[PDB]
Amino acid sequence: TLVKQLSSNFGAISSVLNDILARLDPPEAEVQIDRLITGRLQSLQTYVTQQLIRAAEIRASANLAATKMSECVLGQSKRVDFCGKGYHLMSFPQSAPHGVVFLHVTYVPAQEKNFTTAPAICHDGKAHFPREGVFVSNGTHWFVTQRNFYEPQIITTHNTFVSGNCDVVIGIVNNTVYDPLQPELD
Amino acid sequence: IPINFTISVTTEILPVSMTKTSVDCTMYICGDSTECSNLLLQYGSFCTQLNRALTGIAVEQDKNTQEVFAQVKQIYKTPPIKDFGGFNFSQILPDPSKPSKRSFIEDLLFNKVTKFNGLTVLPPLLTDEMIAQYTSALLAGTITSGWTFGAGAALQIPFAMQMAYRFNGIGVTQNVLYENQKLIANQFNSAIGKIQDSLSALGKLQDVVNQNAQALNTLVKQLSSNFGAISSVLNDILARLDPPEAEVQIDRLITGRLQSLQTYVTQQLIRAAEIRASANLAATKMSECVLGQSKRVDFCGKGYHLMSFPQSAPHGVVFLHVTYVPAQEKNFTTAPAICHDGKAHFPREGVFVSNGTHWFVTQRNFYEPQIITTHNTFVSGNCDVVIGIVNNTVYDPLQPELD
Amino acid sequence: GRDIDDTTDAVRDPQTLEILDITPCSFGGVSVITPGTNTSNQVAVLYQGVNCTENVFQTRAGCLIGAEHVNNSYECDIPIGAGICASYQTSQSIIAYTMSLGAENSVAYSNNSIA
Ligand SMILES: *[C@@H]1O[C@H](CO)[C@@H](O[C@@H]2O[C@H](CO)[C@@H](O)[C@H](O)[C@H]2NC(C)=O)[C@H](O)[C@H]1NC(C)=O
Ligand SMILES: *[C@@H]1O[C@H](CO)[C@@H](O)[C@H](O)[C@H]1NC(C)=O
Ligand SMILES: *[C@@H]1O[C@H](CO)[C@@H](O)[C@H](O)[C@H]1NC(C)=O
Ligand SMILES: *[C@@H]1O[C@H](CO)[C@@H](O)[C@H](O)[C@H]1NC(C)=O
Ligand SMILES: *[C@@H]1O[C@H](CO)[C@@H](O)[C@H](O)[C@H]1NC(C)=O
Ligand SMILES: *[C@@H]1O[C@H](CO)[C@@H](O)[C@H](O)[C@H]1NC(C)=O
Ligand SMILES: *[C@@H]1O[C@H](CO)[C@@H](O)[C@H](O)[C@H]1NC(C)=O
Ligand SMILES: *[C@@H]1O[C@H](CO)[C@@H](O)[C@H](O)[C@H]1NC(C)=O
Ligand SMILES: *[C@@H]1O[C@H](CO)[C@@H](O)[C@H](O)[C@H]1NC(C)=O
Ligand SMILES: *[C@@H]1O[C@H](CO)[C@@H](O)[C@H](O)[C@H]1NC(C)=O
Ligand SMILES: *[C@@H]1O[C@H](CO)[C@@H](O)[C@H](O)[C@H]1NC(C)=O
């Protein structure tokens, strides 16, 4: 755009200074010279303002990139959908011409199953609360497992804790919890 | 230590996009005067540059909305059964009874908000129905599938267990929610009603529309300016002048109006940069607050954060934060640690509290004394290095087994 | 007669002595959508701001010429405006439709079920 805009009379006689400085008397050349100077200065002003705008935009993007490099690479981030899609494991950077390339390694659940759950469990009239997982039952008994991986376990006193009677917690169910210490008593 | 708590709702509004415009360089500067166009062609590529810049702004406008409101590829619809675990969601969810697919809050917001010179205006790519559909889908997803649908396939979870997890993420045990869920439901419903009444203001939205209107009006008013010539009407100047020397007035008018366009385009670019930065911030807020729980302080609302709620607005988006805040206070005596038999003890996660009658351990955000066991604490080192400590026994649940 | 812009829009004829209205007649802009030089050559012109007065298909974004209108839903490929997207699907020709949004599926959501 600049080099094209150089060659344009801007309402003057021609585009060549030498031609202007030859055809006309020097006291008469100043009008054409002034017109050309004004036109070229205006064009340069336009170009520089536009370039300044784009440089500001690129600087903003670069600070974004620096933040992403600082967070994703140098350890994990709980910020969901910030260091990739889904849960985040790590990230590996790469150098590309006038830029960077990130490789986010992620975790995604694949397939699931229907299950029957309940908020809390009643064993001795006093309630029990799971410490890290959920109460699920496929039909036979109740089981505790992590939040996002099916690892059924036998409910134990070391898996839950008591907080009061079962007369206020809605949705509780009747079942039993096995104590590993009782058989050891003999 | 707190003894009671209230659940609140707070609001914050962010602009997303402006009204795209488009001004033809040549047709604005000169009307039907063909020779006015011819003299302009001497100056070169100014018109092309301006046209390209405005088209770039126009496309970036739709880019913003595409970025901030397109996070789900599965349009999740709320099941017909309402009253999710005792919470009344009737003002936010779009009622099928209403012809327009908005709901009460959307309608209130949308009602609350207020070409021969080339002032062409183009419509956006997405209709208000589309953005309403996005809002409904996101709301249903985050109200039925918890947070585990922005990371993969949606998984149905009862609302009670969802909030129970959300408490577990802030530093309180699951007991509090299930013990007082009717109270929390009543408080949440009251808060929603209060915020509904409050809007019945939008200081960050009427500003940008007024800005654009002022700029466009200044452009249009600039036409009547003579700019140091005989008159202002191109046709009038044409009739009373001669082509051999008409160049003076026409040239002066060209220069003046071109300079005006330069100023206007620079202002529009600056405003576009600001708006796009705001939209990027809004997108980050959508990714963090909505599809998850963020531990960053006073970012997803004020105070401890639980869960957010998005909405729709004219040229903007309205967020609803649901936080959790301590209510009452009660002083207590503390001790850095407790010594039992010459062995130092430290609490596992809570803190030692002495009513004066005895000693108890409770978490940091909801008073709930417990008998000091060996499972709520652990031992390490002697008691002769800690600055402050008190003498008190530690119960052992192994004693009843000794019968 | 003037307007908010102080521009002539109403005149009195010295002969008939009547109120005459003036309305703009210069208007229009051209947008051309193509499926690509490599693919085919059929094109569908678009006019930005004119009523369908001058196979037509009127939309709020203007008057469209040279495209078949269908109710069949499809994922949006190229934009025009007001939720209308064009494509090169069937032989093959230029078609227009309301924008589609993925697929619809609710969730089970039993008040005592988990996944
Ligand atoms: C925490 O504060 C709430 C809000 O006041 C209390 O809930 C009130 O309890 C009284 C006492 O029964 C009732 O009469 C009110 O109807 C309840 N609601 C309101 C809005 O006042 C709650 O009791 C407080 N917590 C404790 C442990 O007292
Ligand atoms: C699932 O149910 C079957 C029969 O009802 C039972 O044998 C099995 O133990 C159950 N699953 C687990 C993990 O216990
Ligand atoms: C779930 O809904 C059914 C529908 O009537 C009801 O009978 C049942 O008590 C509900 N369960 C809980 C835990 O609210
Ligand atoms: C659980 O058992 C107790 C004691 O027999 C009984 O009172 C209560 O109704 C039972 N509840 C359920 C849900 O089985
Ligand atoms: C929610 O509150 C509104 C307010 O009047 C009421 O009309 C509606 O029936 C309530 N819904 C439920 C499920 O309680
Ligand atoms: C803090 O509460 C205790 C209750 O034991 C009270 O004695 C004390 O005066 C309170 N502190 C102040 C500054 O009032
Ligand atoms: C606490 O402050 C009081 C006030 O002077 C002082 O007498 C006491 O020794 C201090 N104890 C500790 C453990 O800092
Ligand atoms: C705790 O008891 C021991 C045992 O007599 C004693 O030496 C120590 O001074 C006591 N700590 C106090 C009084 O703070
Ligand atoms: C002037 O106007 C009158 C009334 O409109 C008409 O009768 C007459 O012919 C006109 N004469 C001229 C010279 O325009
Ligand atoms: C056109 O596209 C096809 C497949 O997309 C490709 O095989 C072919 O080389 C392309 N031709 C040209 C001229 O681009
Ligand atoms: C186009 O003109 C016809 C004829 O008056 C009119 O019925 C129709 O509403 C117009 N359409 C638009 C979009 O202005």
Side-chain angles (χ1 to χ4, degrees), chain A residues 18-38:
Chain A
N18 295 319
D19 184 28
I20 298 302
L21 273 295
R23 187 171 294 95
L24 274 296
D25 185 63
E28 281 73 358
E30 284 84 5
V31 286
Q32 312 305 296
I33 300 302
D34 192 75
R35 278 185 179 285
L36 287 190
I37 295 315
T38 300

PDB file of all heavy atoms in Angstrom, chain A residues 18-38:
ATOM      1  N   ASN A  18      11.720  15.450 -10.308  1.00  0.00           N
ATOM      2  CA  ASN A  18      12.638  15.983 -11.309  1.00  0.00           C
ATOM      3  C   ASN A  18      11.880  16.600 -12.474  1.00  0.00           C
ATOM      4  O   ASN A  18      12.249  17.673 -12.967  1.00  0.00           O
ATOM      5  CB  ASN A  18      13.569  14.877 -11.803  1.00  0.00           C
ATOM      6  CG  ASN A  18      14.491  14.365 -10.717  1.00  0.00           C
ATOM      7  OD1 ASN A  18      15.020  15.138  -9.920  1.00  0.00           O
ATOM      8  ND2 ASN A  18      14.689  13.052 -10.682  1.00  0.00           N
ATOM      9  N   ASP A  19      10.814  15.939 -12.926  1.00  0.00           N
ATOM     10  CA  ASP A  19      10.008  16.489 -14.008  1.00  0.00           C
ATOM     11  C   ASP A  19       9.361  17.805 -13.596  1.00  0.00           C
ATOM     12  O   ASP A  19       9.322  18.759 -14.380  1.00  0.00           O
ATOM     13  CB  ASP A  19       8.948  15.475 -14.434  1.00  0.00           C
ATOM     14  CG  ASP A  19       8.143  15.941 -15.627  1.00  0.00           C
ATOM     15  OD1 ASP A  19       8.678  16.727 -16.436  1.00  0.00           O
ATOM     16  OD2 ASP A  19       6.975  15.520 -15.758  1.00  0.00           O
ATOM     17  N   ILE A  20       8.848  17.873 -12.366  1.00  0.00           N
ATOM     18  CA  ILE A  20       8.264  19.117 -11.880  1.00  0.00           C
ATOM     19  C   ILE A  20       9.333  20.192 -11.750  1.00  0.00           C
ATOM     20  O   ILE A  20       9.123  21.345 -12.143  1.00  0.00           O
ATOM     21  CB  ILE A  20       7.535  18.879 -10.547  1.00  0.00           C
ATOM     22  CG1 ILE A  20       6.390  17.890 -10.746  1.00  0.00           C
ATOM     23  CG2 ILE A  20       7.008  20.188  -9.993  1.00  0.00           C
ATOM     24  CD1 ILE A  20       5.381  18.343 -11.766  1.00  0.00           C
ATOM     25  N   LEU A  21      10.496  19.833 -11.216  1.00  0.00           N
ATOM     26  CA  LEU A  21      11.591  20.779 -11.048  1.00  0.00           C
ATOM     27  C   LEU A  21      12.290  21.118 -12.356  1.00  0.00           C
ATOM     28  O   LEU A  21      13.357  21.739 -12.329  1.00  0.00           O
ATOM     29  CB  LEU A  21      12.610  20.242 -10.040  1.00  0.00           C
ATOM     30  CG  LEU A  21      12.357  20.549  -8.561  1.00  0.00           C
ATOM     31  CD1 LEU A  21      12.449  22.046  -8.320  1.00  0.00           C
ATOM     32  CD2 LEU A  21      11.018  20.018  -8.082  1.00  0.00           C
ATOM     33  N   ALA A  22      11.724  20.726 -13.489  1.00  0.00           N
ATOM     34  CA  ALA A  22      12.258  21.087 -14.794  1.00  0.00           C
ATOM     35  C   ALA A  22      11.268  21.854 -15.651  1.00  0.00           C
ATOM     36  O   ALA A  22      11.658  22.802 -16.338  1.00  0.00           O
ATOM     37  CB  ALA A  22      12.716  19.829 -15.543  1.00  0.00           C
ATOM     38  N   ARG A  23       9.990  21.475 -15.628  1.00  0.00           N
ATOM     39  CA  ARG A  23       9.004  22.108 -16.492  1.00  0.00           C
ATOM     40  C   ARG A  23       8.576  23.485 -16.005  1.00  0.00           C
ATOM     41  O   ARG A  23       8.252  24.343 -16.833  1.00  0.00           O
ATOM     42  CB  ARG A  23       7.773  21.209 -16.626  1.00  0.00           C
ATOM     43  CG  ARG A  23       6.751  21.707 -17.636  1.00  0.00           C
ATOM     44  CD  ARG A  23       5.646  20.692 -17.899  1.00  0.00           C
ATOM     45  NE  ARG A  23       6.134  19.486 -18.557  1.00  0.00           N
ATOM     46  CZ  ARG A  23       6.487  18.376 -17.924  1.00  0.00           C
ATOM     47  NH1 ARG A  23       6.395  18.273 -16.608  1.00  0.00           N
ATOM     48  NH2 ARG A  23       6.936  17.342 -18.628  1.00  0.00           N
ATOM     49  N   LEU A  24       8.575  23.725 -14.699  1.00  0.00           N
ATOM     50  CA  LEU A  24       8.008  24.942 -14.139  1.00  0.00           C
ATOM     51  C   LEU A  24       9.088  25.820 -13.525  1.00  0.00           C
ATOM     52  O   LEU A  24      10.136  25.339 -13.085  1.00  0.00           O
ATOM     53  CB  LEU A  24       6.941  24.632 -13.082  1.00  0.00           C
ATOM     54  CG  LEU A  24       5.512  24.389 -13.571  1.00  0.00           C
ATOM     55  CD1 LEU A  24       4.965  25.648 -14.225  1.00  0.00           C
ATOM     56  CD2 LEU A  24       5.423  23.206 -14.522  1.00  0.00           C
ATOM     57  N   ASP A  25       8.812  27.117 -13.514  1.00  0.00           N
ATOM     58  CA  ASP A  25       9.710  28.083 -12.895  1.00  0.00           C
ATOM     59  C   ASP A  25       9.765  27.840 -11.391  1.00  0.00           C
ATOM     60  O   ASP A  25       8.724  27.591 -10.772  1.00  0.00           O
ATOM     61  CB  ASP A  25       9.228  29.496 -13.217  1.00  0.00           C
ATOM     62  CG  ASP A  25      10.166  30.571 -12.714  1.00  0.00           C
ATOM     63  OD1 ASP A  25      11.326  30.617 -13.176  1.00  0.00           O
ATOM     64  OD2 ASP A  25       9.726  31.405 -11.897  1.00  0.00           O
ATOM     65  N   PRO A  26      10.945  27.883 -10.776  1.00  0.00           N
ATOM     66  CA  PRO A  26      11.088  27.445  -9.375  1.00  0.00           C
ATOM     67  C   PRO A  26      10.164  28.194  -8.426  1.00  0.00           C
ATOM     68  O   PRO A  26       9.630  27.582  -7.491  1.00  0.00           O
ATOM     69  CB  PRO A  26      12.567  27.721  -9.064  1.00  0.00           C
ATOM     70  CG  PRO A  26      13.245  27.656 -10.384  1.00  0.00           C
ATOM     71  CD  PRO A  26      12.249  28.082 -11.432  1.00  0.00           C
ATOM     72  N   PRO A  27       9.937  29.503  -8.610  1.00  0.00           N
ATOM     73  CA  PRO A  27       8.907  30.169  -7.794  1.00  0.00           C
ATOM     74  C   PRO A  27       7.506  29.613  -7.981  1.00  0.00           C
ATOM     75  O   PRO A  27       6.631  29.903  -7.157  1.00  0.00           O
ATOM     76  CB  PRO A  27       8.991  31.629  -8.249  1.00  0.00           C
ATOM     77  CG  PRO A  27      10.399  31.800  -8.609  1.00  0.00           C
ATOM     78  CD  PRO A  27      10.813  30.504  -9.250  1.00  0.00           C
ATOM     79  N   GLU A  28       7.253  28.844  -9.036  1.00  0.00           N
ATOM     80  CA  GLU A  28       5.943  28.246  -9.248  1.00  0.00           C
ATOM     81  C   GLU A  28       5.878  26.779  -8.849  1.00  0.00           C
ATOM     82  O   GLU A  28       4.781  26.212  -8.817  1.00  0.00           O
ATOM     83  CB  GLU A  28       5.532  28.391 -10.719  1.00  0.00           C
ATOM     84  CG  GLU A  28       5.004  29.770 -11.078  1.00  0.00           C
ATOM     85  CD  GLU A  28       6.095  30.824 -11.147  1.00  0.00           C
ATOM     86  OE1 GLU A  28       7.272  30.495 -10.885  1.00  0.00           O
ATOM     87  OE2 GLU A  28       5.775  31.988 -11.460  1.00  0.00           O
ATOM     88  N   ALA A  29       7.014  26.154  -8.543  1.00  0.00           N
ATOM     89  CA  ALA A  29       7.010  24.733  -8.215  1.00  0.00           C
ATOM     90  C   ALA A  29       6.532  24.466  -6.796  1.00  0.00           C
ATOM     91  O   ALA A  29       6.142  23.333  -6.486  1.00  0.00           O
ATOM     92  CB  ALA A  29       8.408  24.146  -8.409  1.00  0.00           C
ATOM     93  N   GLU A  30       6.552  25.487  -5.933  1.00  0.00           N
ATOM     94  CA  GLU A  30       6.279  25.266  -4.517  1.00  0.00           C
ATOM     95  C   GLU A  30       4.872  24.745  -4.278  1.00  0.00           C
ATOM     96  O   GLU A  30       4.665  23.957  -3.356  1.00  0.00           O
ATOM     97  CB  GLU A  30       6.499  26.549  -3.720  1.00  0.00           C
ATOM     98  CG  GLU A  30       7.955  26.888  -3.495  1.00  0.00           C
ATOM     99  CD  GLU A  30       8.542  27.634  -4.662  1.00  0.00           C
ATOM    100  OE1 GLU A  30       7.772  27.953  -5.587  1.00  0.00           O
ATOM    101  OE2 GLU A  30       9.762  27.899  -4.658  1.00  0.00           O
ATOM    102  N   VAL A  31       3.894  25.172  -5.075  1.00  0.00           N
ATOM    103  CA  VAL A  31       2.533  24.687  -4.871  1.00  0.00           C
ATOM    104  C   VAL A  31       2.465  23.181  -5.097  1.00  0.00           C
ATOM    105  O   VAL A  31       1.922  22.433  -4.272  1.00  0.00           O
ATOM    106  CB  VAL A  31       1.549  25.453  -5.772  1.00  0.00           C
ATOM    107  CG1 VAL A  31       1.332  26.854  -5.233  1.00  0.00           C
ATOM    108  CG2 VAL A  31       2.074  25.527  -7.193  1.00  0.00           C
ATOM    109  N   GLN A  32       3.041  22.711  -6.203  1.00  0.00           N
ATOM    110  CA  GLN A  32       3.046  21.280  -6.477  1.00  0.00           C
ATOM    111  C   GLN A  32       3.841  20.526  -5.422  1.00  0.00           C
ATOM    112  O   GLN A  32       3.422  19.455  -4.960  1.00  0.00           O
ATOM    113  CB  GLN A  32       3.615  21.019  -7.869  1.00  0.00           C
ATOM    114  CG  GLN A  32       3.022  21.902  -8.948  1.00  0.00           C
ATOM    115  CD  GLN A  32       1.514  21.806  -9.006  1.00  0.00           C
ATOM    116  OE1 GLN A  32       0.960  20.749  -9.308  1.00  0.00           O
ATOM    117  NE2 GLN A  32       0.840  22.910  -8.717  1.00  0.00           N
ATOM    118  N   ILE A  33       4.991  21.070  -5.025  1.00  0.00           N
ATOM    119  CA  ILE A  33       5.813  20.394  -4.028  1.00  0.00           C
ATOM    120  C   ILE A  33       5.061  20.289  -2.711  1.00  0.00           C
ATOM    121  O   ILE A  33       5.076  19.244  -2.052  1.00  0.00           O
ATOM    122  CB  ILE A  33       7.161  21.116  -3.864  1.00  0.00           C
ATOM    123  CG1 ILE A  33       7.917  21.119  -5.190  1.00  0.00           C
ATOM    124  CG2 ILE A  33       7.999  20.445  -2.791  1.00  0.00           C
ATOM    125  CD1 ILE A  33       8.169  19.736  -5.739  1.00  0.00           C
ATOM    126  N   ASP A  34       4.382  21.364  -2.312  1.00  0.00           N
ATOM    127  CA  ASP A  34       3.623  21.352  -1.071  1.00  0.00           C
ATOM    128  C   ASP A  34       2.496  20.334  -1.132  1.00  0.00           C
ATOM    129  O   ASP A  34       2.251  19.608  -0.160  1.00  0.00           O
ATOM    130  CB  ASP A  34       3.077  22.753  -0.793  1.00  0.00           C
ATOM    131  CG  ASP A  34       2.536  22.903   0.610  1.00  0.00           C
ATOM    132  OD1 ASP A  34       3.350  23.002   1.552  1.00  0.00           O
ATOM    133  OD2 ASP A  34       1.299  22.934   0.772  1.00  0.00           O
ATOM    134  N   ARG A  35       1.801  20.258  -2.269  1.00  0.00           N
ATOM    135  CA  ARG A  35       0.736  19.271  -2.403  1.00  0.00           C
ATOM    136  C   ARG A  35       1.283  17.858  -2.259  1.00  0.00           C
ATOM    137  O   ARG A  35       0.715  17.025  -1.538  1.00  0.00           O
ATOM    138  CB  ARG A  35       0.031  19.436  -3.746  1.00  0.00           C
ATOM    139  CG  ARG A  35      -1.020  20.519  -3.760  1.00  0.00           C
ATOM    140  CD  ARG A  35      -1.753  20.540  -5.085  1.00  0.00           C
ATOM    141  NE  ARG A  35      -2.786  21.568  -5.114  1.00  0.00           N
ATOM    142  CZ  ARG A  35      -3.949  21.481  -4.482  1.00  0.00           C
ATOM    143  NH1 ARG A  35      -4.269  20.414  -3.767  1.00  0.00           N
ATOM    144  NH2 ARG A  35      -4.812  22.487  -4.574  1.00  0.00           N
ATOM    145  N   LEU A  36       2.398  17.574  -2.932  1.00  0.00           N
ATOM    146  CA  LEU A  36       2.981  16.241  -2.849  1.00  0.00           C
ATOM    147  C   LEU A  36       3.420  15.920  -1.428  1.00  0.00           C
ATOM    148  O   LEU A  36       3.208  14.802  -0.939  1.00  0.00           O
ATOM    149  CB  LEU A  36       4.155  16.121  -3.816  1.00  0.00           C
ATOM    150  CG  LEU A  36       3.745  16.035  -5.282  1.00  0.00           C
ATOM    151  CD1 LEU A  36       4.934  15.672  -6.148  1.00  0.00           C
ATOM    152  CD2 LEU A  36       2.631  15.023  -5.449  1.00  0.00           C
ATOM    153  N   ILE A  37       4.036  16.890  -0.750  1.00  0.00           N
ATOM    154  CA  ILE A  37       4.494  16.663   0.615  1.00  0.00           C
ATOM    155  C   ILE A  37       3.314  16.364   1.525  1.00  0.00           C
ATOM    156  O   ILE A  37       3.355  15.429   2.334  1.00  0.00           O
ATOM    157  CB  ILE A  37       5.303  17.871   1.120  1.00  0.00           C
ATOM    158  CG1 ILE A  37       6.591  18.028   0.315  1.00  0.00           C
ATOM    159  CG2 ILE A  37       5.616  17.720   2.593  1.00  0.00           C
ATOM    160  CD1 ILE A  37       7.322  16.747   0.084  1.00  0.00           C
ATOM    161  N   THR A  38       2.239  17.145   1.401  1.00  0.00           N
ATOM    162  CA  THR A  38       1.069  16.912   2.237  1.00  0.00           C
ATOM    163  C   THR A  38       0.483  15.530   1.987  1.00  0.00           C
ATOM    164  O   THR A  38       0.155  14.805   2.935  1.00  0.00           O
ATOM    165  CB  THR A  38       0.021  17.996   1.990  1.00  0.00           C
ATOM    166  OG1 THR A  38       0.578  19.276   2.306  1.00  0.00           O
ATOM    167  CG2 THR A  38      -1.198  17.762   2.859  1.00  0.00           C
TER     168      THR A  38
END
